[PDB]
Amino acid sequence: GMSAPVTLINPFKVPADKLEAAIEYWEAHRDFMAQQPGYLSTQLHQSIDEGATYQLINVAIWQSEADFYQAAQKMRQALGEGLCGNPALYRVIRT
Amino acid sequence: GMSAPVTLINPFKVPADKLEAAIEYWEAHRDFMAQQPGYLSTQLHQSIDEGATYQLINVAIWQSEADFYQAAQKMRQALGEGLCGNPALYRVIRT
Ligand SMILES: [Cl-]
Ligand SMILES: [Cl-]
Structure with a gap:
């Protein structure tokens, strides 16, 4: 693709x-x-309710999947309690 | 506030x-x-990997908390297997 x-x-x-x-x-x-x-850009969102499942959700824009994957591999090398993310890539399908 | x-x-x-x-x-x-x-607007995001935890994530913008809460109460009246959301409200805190 x-x-x-x-x-x-x-x-x-x-x-x-x-x-x-x-x-x-x-x-x-x-x-x-x-x-x-x-x-390209990012927006770190904080929940208005401290009891939300996800008190932080980051939404970042990358020029391509390749660029993101390349950057993620590098961060494992460069940067390596209980904070847990669940990153995935998306595209917008409806507005 | x-x-x-x-x-x-x-x-x-x-x-x-x-x-x-x-x-x-x-x-x-x-x-x-x-x-x-x-x-105001919405962006329904679809995961590129079908195995993502969340294959859909909607991100919508509302003019205020009050407007959203008012609209959510109305939808319970108007619209009422296994599809599970977890809606919460946020504001952007870092870019
Ligand atoms: Cl992140
Ligand atoms: Cl939604």
């Missing part, structure tokens, strides 16, 4: 009382990813 | 082999919500 822009959606389970630590962890990772070829 | 635009993020667990049915269910609901005061 041909490359096309993709969206990473990564919902996080944030431990009780550890939101700021989770944000700052996320920021360190964003700073690495933002330097990678194909990175 | 003062009202401000909010984002609904609703990740769906889609039963094996039932993606199209789930889309069409989602569309019927979108058609109701799109008529409600304060509805």
